[PDB]
Amino acid sequence: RSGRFGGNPGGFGNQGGFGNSRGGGAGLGNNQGSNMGGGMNFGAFSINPAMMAAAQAALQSSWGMMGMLASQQNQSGPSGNNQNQGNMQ
Amino acid sequence: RSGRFGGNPGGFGNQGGFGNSRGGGAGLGNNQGSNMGGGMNFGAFSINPAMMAAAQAALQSSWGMMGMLASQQNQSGPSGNNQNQGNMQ
Amino acid sequence: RSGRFGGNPGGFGNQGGFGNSRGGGAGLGNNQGSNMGGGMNFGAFSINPAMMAAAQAALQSSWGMMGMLASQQNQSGPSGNNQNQGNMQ
Amino acid sequence: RSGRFGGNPGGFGNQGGFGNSRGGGAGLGNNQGSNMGGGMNFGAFSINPAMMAAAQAALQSSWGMMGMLASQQNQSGPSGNNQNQGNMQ
Amino acid sequence: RSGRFGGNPGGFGNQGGFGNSRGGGAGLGNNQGSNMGGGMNFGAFSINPAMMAAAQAALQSSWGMMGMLASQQNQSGPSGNNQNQGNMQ
């Protein structure tokens, strides 16, 4: 057994004011042989976020436990494309 | 047994003010041999979010437990395309 | 047994003010050999969201437990297309 | 047994103000060998959302437990198409 | 058994003021043979965040326990593309 994470509860008491936090958890954990990105925005529990992303990319991944024996992965990336995106006003 | 996550409950007490948090969880966890992205926006529990994404990409992934034996994955990416997207006003 | 997630209940007490949170959960978890993206917007429980996405892409994935033995996946991506999308006013 | 998710109930107490939340859940979970995207908008429980998506894409996926033995998947993507979409005013 | 993380609960007591924290957790942990990036923004539990990312990239990863025997990974990156993204006002 492996890859455990504990809880982050809020606890006992009142809360007031501006931009405070108690307990909570955020991030990227326990992923196996996976790809995340190549042009991606992620936003949660937030006030007025603004985000811009632009990517020309190639990603390749692999995980094996008594696996990937006498095998092959082959990838050729994007070639010769044209793309235009307008304004947000 | 593996890959456990604890709960993040809010707890006991009142809450007032501006932009506070107690307990909660957000992110990307326990994915196996998967792809996420290549032009994607994600927004939840938020006020006035604004997001722009543009991608030219290739993604390839694999997971095996007594698997992927004497096998092959082959990928050729996008080639020679044209794309135009207008304005948001 | 594996891949467990705890609950994030709200708890006991009153709530007022502007943009506060207690308990809750959001994201991408426990996916196996799947693809998510290539031009996608996702929005939930939000006020005035604005989102633009544009993609030229190829995605390929695989998961095997005593599987994918002496097998093959082959993919050739998009080639030679034209696309125009107008304005939103 | 695997792939469990806990409940996110609202709890006990009053609620007033602007843009607050208690309990709740949103996202993408426990999918096996599936495809999601290639030009898709998703919106739920929201006020005045605006979304634009444009895609030229290919997606391919597979899941096997004592499966996918001596087998094949073959895909050739879109080629030589023309498409125009007008304005929303 | 390995790769354990303890909980960061909030504890017992009241909380007021401006920008304080008690307990909590944030980051990237326990990933195996995976890729994260190539044009990506991530924001959670925040007030007025602003983020810009631009990438021309290639990423390649691998994990094996009695795996990756007599095998190969081959990657050729993006070549000859053009991309323009507009303003956010």
Author numbering:
A (entry chain C), B (entry chain B), C (entry chain U), D (entry chain A), E (entry chain D): 272 to 360
Provide the authors' own sentences about this structure as they appear in the paper.
TAR DNA-binding protein 43 (TDP-43) is a ubiquitously expressed RNA-binding protein with diverse roles in RNA processing. The carboxy-terminal part comprises an intrinsically disordered low-complexity domain (LCD), which contains regions enriched in glycine, hydrophobic residues, and glutamine and asparagine (Q/N). The abnormal assembly of TAR DNA-binding protein 43 (TDP-43) in neuronal and glial cells characterizes nearly all cases of amyotrophic lateral sclerosis (ALS) and around half of cases of frontotemporal lobar degeneration (FTLD). Here we report the cryo-electron microscopy structures of assembled TDP-43 from the brains of three individuals with the most common type of FTLD-TDP, type A. TDP-43 formed amyloid filaments with a new fold that was the same across individuals, indicating that this fold may characterize type A FTLD-TDP.
The fold consists of five connected layers formed by R272–Q360 in the LCD. The first two layers are formed by the glycine-rich region (G274–G310), the hydrophobic region (M311–S342) contributes the third and fourth layers, and the Q/N-rich region (Q343–Q360) forms the fifth layer. The fold is centred around a kinked, 11-residue β-strand formed by A321–Q331 in the fourth layer, which forms steric zippers with β-strands in the neighbouring third and fifth layers and imparts an arrangement that resembles a three-bar chevron badge. Owing to this resemblance, we hereafter refer to the fold as the chevron fold. In addition to hydrogen bonding within intermolecular β-sheets, the filaments are stabilized by hydrogen bonding ladders formed by glutamine and asparagine side chains and by staggered stacking interactions between aromatic residues. The third, R293, is located in an unusual buried position inside a compact loop linking the first and second layers. The side chain of R293 is completely buried in the main conformation of the chevron fold, and its positive charge is only partially compensated by hydrogen bonds to the surrounding peptide groups. The overall effect of this buried charge is expected to be destabilizing. We proposed the hypothesis that the burial of this residue may have been facilitated by the post-translational modification citrullination (deimination), in which the charged guanidinium group of arginine is hydrolysed, yielding a neutral ureido group. Analysis of filaments from the brains of the individuals with type A FTLD-TDP by mass spectrometry established the presence of TDP-43 molecules that were citrullinated at R293.
